Tab-separated table of C-alpha atoms and ligand atoms in Angstrom:
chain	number	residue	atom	x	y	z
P	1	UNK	CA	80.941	13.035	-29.322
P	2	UNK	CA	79.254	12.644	-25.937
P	3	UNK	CA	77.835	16.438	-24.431
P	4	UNK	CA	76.842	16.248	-21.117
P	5	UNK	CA	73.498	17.601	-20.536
P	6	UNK	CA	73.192	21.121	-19.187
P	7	UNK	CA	71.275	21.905	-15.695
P	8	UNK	CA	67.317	21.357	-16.560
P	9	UNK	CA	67.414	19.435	-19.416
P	10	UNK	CA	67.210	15.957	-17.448
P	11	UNK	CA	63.926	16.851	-15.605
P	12	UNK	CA	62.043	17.621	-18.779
P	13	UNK	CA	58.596	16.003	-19.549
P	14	UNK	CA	59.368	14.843	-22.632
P	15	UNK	CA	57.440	12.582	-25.353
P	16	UNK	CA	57.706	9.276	-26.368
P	17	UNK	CA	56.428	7.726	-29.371
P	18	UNK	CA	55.322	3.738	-29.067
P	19	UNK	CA	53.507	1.056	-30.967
P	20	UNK	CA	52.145	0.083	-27.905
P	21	UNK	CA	47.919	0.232	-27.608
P	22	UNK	CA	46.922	2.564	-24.754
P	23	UNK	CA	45.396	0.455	-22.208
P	24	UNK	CA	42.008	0.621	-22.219
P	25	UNK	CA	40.552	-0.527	-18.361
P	26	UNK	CA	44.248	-0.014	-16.698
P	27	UNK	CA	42.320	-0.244	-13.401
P	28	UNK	CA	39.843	-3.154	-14.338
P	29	UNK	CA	37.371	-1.174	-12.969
P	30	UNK	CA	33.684	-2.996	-12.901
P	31	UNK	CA	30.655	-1.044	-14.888
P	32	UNK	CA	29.691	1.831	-12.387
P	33	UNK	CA	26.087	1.703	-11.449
P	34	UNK	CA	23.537	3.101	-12.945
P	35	UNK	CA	22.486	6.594	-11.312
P	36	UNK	CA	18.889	7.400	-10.429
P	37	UNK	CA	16.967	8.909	-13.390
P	38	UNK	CA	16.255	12.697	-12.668
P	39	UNK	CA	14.071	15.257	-11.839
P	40	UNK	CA	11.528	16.363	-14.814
P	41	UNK	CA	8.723	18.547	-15.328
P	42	UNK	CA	6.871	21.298	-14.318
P	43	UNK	CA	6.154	22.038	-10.672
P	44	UNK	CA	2.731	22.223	-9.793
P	45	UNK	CA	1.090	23.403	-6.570
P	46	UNK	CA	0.010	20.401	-3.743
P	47	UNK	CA	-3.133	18.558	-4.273
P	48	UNK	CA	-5.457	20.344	-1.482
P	49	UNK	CA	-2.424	21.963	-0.004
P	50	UNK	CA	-0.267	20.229	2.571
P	51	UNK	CA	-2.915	17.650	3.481
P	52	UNK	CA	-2.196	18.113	7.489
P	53	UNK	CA	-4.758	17.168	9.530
P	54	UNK	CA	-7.226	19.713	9.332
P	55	UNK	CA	-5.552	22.182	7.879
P	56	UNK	CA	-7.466	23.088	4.715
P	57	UNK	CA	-4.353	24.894	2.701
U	1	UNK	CA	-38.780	31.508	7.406
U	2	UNK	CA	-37.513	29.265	4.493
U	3	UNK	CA	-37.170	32.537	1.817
U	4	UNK	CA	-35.587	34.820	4.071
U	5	UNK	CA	-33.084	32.582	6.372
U	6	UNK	CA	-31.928	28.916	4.343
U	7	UNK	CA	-31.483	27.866	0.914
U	8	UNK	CA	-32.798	25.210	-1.076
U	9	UNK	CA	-32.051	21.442	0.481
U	10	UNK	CA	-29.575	21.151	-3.552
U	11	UNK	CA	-27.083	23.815	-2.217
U	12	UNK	CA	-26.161	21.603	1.189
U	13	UNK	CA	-26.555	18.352	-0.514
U	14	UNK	CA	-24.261	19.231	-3.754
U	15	UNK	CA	-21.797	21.275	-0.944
U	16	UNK	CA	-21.588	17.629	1.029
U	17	UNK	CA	-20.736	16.105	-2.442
U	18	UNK	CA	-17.644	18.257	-3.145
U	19	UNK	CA	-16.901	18.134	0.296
U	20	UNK	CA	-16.796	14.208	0.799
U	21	UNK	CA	-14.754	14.032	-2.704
U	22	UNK	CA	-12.177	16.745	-1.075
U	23	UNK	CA	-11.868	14.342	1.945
U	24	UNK	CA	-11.828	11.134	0.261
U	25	UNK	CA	-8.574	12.356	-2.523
U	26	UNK	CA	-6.970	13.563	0.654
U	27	UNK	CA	-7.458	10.478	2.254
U	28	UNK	CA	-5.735	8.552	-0.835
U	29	UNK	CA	-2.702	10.937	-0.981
U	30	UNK	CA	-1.824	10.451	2.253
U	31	UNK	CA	-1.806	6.460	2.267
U	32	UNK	CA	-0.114	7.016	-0.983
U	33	UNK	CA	2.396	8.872	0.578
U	34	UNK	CA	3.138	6.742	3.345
U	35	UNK	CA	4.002	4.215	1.105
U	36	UNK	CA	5.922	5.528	-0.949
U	37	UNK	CA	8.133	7.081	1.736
U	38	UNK	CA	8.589	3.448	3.032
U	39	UNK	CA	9.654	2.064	-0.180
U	40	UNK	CA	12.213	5.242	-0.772
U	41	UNK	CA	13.248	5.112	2.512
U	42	UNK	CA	13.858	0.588	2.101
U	43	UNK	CA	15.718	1.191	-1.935
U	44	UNK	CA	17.244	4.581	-2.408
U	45	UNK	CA	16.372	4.659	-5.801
U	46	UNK	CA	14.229	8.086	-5.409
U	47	UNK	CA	14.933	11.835	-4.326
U	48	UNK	CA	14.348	11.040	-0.960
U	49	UNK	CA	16.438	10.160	1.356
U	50	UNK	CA	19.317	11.058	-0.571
U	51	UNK	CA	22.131	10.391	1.967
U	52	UNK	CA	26.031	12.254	0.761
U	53	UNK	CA	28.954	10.356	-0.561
U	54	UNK	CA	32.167	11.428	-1.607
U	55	UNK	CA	32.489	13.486	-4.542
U	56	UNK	CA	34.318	12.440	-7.275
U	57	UNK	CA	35.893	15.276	-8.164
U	58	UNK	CA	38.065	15.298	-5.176
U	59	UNK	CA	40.053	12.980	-7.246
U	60	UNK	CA	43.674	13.473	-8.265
U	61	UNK	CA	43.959	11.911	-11.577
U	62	UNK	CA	48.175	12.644	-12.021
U	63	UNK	CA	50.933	10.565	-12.306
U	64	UNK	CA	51.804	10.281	-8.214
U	65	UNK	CA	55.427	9.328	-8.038
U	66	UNK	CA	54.954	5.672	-8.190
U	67	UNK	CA	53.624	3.892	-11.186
U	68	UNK	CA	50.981	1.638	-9.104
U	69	UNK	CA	49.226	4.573	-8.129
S	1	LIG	C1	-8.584	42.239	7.905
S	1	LIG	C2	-9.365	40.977	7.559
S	1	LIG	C3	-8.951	40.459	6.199
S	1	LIG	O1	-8.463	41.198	5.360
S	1	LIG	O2	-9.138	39.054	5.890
S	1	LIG	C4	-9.189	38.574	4.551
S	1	LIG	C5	-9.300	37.055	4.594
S	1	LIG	C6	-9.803	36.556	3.246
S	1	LIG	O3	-10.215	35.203	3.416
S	1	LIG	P1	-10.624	34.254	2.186
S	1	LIG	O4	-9.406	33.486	1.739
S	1	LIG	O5	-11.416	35.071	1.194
S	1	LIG	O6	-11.619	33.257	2.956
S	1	LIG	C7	-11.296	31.883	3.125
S	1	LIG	C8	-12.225	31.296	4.179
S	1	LIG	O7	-11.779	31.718	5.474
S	1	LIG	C9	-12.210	29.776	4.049
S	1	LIG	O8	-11.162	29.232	4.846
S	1	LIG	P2	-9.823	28.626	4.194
S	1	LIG	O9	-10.162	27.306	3.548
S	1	LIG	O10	-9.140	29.706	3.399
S	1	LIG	O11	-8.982	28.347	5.529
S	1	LIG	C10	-7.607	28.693	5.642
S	1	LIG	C11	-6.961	27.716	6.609
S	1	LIG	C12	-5.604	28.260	7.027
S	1	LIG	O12	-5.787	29.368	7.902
S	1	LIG	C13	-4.990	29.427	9.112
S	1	LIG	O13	-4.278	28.478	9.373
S	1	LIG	C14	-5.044	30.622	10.032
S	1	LIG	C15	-6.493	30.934	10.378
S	1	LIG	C16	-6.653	31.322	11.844
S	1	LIG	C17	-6.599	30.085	12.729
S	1	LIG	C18	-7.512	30.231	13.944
S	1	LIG	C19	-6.827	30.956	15.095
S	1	LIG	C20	-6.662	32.436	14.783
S	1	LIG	C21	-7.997	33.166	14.881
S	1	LIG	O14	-7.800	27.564	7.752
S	1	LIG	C22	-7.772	26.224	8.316
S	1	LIG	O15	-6.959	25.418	7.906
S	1	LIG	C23	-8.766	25.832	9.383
S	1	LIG	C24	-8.037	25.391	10.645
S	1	LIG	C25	-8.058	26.498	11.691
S	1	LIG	C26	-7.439	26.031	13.003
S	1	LIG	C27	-5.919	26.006	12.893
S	1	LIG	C28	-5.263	25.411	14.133
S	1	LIG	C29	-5.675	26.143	15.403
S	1	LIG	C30	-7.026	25.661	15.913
S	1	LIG	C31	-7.370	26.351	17.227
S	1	LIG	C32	-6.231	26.216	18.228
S	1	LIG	O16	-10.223	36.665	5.611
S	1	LIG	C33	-9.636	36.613	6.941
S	1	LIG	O17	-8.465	36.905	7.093
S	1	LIG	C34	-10.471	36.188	8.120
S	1	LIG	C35	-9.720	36.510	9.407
S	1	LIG	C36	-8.500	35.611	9.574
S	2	LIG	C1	-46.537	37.873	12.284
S	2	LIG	C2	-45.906	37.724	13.703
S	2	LIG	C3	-45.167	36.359	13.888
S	2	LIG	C4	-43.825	36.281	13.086
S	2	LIG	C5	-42.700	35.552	13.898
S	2	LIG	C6	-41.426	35.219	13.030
S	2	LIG	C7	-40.340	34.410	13.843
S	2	LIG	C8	-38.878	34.916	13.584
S	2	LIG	C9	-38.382	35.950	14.666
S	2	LIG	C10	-37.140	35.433	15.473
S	2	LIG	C11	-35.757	35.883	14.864
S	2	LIG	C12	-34.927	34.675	14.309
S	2	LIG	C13	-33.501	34.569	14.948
S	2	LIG	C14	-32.370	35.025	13.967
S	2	LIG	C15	-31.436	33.839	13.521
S	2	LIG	C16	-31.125	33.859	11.976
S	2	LIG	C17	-29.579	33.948	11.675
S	2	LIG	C18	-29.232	33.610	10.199
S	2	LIG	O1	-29.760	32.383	9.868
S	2	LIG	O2	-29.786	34.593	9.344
S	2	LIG	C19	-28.905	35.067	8.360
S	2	LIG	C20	-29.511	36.325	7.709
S	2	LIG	O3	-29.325	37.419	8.608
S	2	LIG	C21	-30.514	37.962	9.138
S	2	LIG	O4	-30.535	39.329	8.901
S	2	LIG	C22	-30.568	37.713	10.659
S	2	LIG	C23	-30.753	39.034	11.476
S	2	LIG	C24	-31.408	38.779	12.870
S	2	LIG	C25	-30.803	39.672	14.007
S	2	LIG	C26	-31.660	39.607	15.314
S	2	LIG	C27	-31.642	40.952	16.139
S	2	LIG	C28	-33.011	41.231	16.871
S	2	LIG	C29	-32.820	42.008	18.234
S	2	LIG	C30	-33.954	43.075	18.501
S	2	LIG	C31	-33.381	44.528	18.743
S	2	LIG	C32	-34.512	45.635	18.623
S	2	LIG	C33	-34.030	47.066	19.056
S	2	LIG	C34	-33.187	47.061	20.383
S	2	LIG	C35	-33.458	48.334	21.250
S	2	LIG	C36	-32.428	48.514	22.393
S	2	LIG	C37	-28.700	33.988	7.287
S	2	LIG	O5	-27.515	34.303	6.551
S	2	LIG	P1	-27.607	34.264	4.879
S	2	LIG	O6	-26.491	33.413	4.311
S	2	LIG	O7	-27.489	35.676	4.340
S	2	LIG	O8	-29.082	33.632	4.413
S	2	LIG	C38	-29.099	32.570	3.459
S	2	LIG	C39	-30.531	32.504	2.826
S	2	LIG	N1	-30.671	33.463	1.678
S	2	LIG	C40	-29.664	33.071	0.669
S	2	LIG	C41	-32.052	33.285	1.140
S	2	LIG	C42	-30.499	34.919	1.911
């Protein structure tokens, strides 16, 4: 009682069910460092302007 | 001479006051900023000097033929 599979049906994604746990750290992967904390609050104008050398704004 | 062409000796002397304090917070900011554009500049850890990596998302995350990646 054997069919032989048509044209197509061999290449399907297909899905498979398993008792096995998903791994969890498949790459083993080290703890990614910690990014630099952000940008926050308002923006205020410079403190006596730019501050070049005698420039007064 | 005094009433018609100068003012009072309080108007130069409270003038040199805000003047001096002007110069003097200037004075701070800038050592202030000197340093900490050397310690940025040594760590990293600010928003200076903020040199590009590779983004991330440039990242194929798909099954690629082989299962070892
Ligand atoms: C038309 C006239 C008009 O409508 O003017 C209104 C305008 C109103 O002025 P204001 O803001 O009420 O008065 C501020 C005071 O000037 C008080 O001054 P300030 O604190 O606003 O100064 C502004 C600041 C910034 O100003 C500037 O940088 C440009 C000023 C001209 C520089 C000098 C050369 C050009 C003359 O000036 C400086 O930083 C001083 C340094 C100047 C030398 C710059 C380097 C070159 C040196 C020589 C080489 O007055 C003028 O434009 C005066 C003519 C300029
Ligand atoms: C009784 C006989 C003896 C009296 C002798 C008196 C001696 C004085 C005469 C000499 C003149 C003085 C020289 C002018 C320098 C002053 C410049 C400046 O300091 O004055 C300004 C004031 O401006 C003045 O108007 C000066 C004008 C002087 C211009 C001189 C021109 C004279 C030339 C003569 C021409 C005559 C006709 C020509 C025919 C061809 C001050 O600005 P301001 O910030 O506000 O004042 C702050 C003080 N406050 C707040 C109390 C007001």
């Amino acid at each position: 009682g054997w069919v032989r599979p048509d044209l197509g049906e061999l290449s399907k994604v297909t899905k498979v069910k398993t008792d096995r746990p998903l791994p969890e750290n498949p790459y083993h992967s080290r703890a990614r460092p910690e990014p630099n904390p952000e940008a926050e609050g308002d923006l205020k104008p410079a403190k006596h302007g730019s501050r070049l050398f005698f420039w007064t704004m | 001479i005094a009433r018609t062409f100068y003012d009072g000796p309080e108007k130069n002397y409270e003038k040199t006051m805000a003047i001096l304090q002007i110069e003097a917070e200037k004075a701070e900011l800038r050592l202030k900023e000197l340093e900490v554009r050397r310690l940025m500049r040594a760590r990293g850890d600010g928003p200076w000097y903020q040199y590009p990596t590779i983004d991330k998302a440039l990242i194929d995350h798909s099954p690629k033929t082989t299962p070892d990646n």
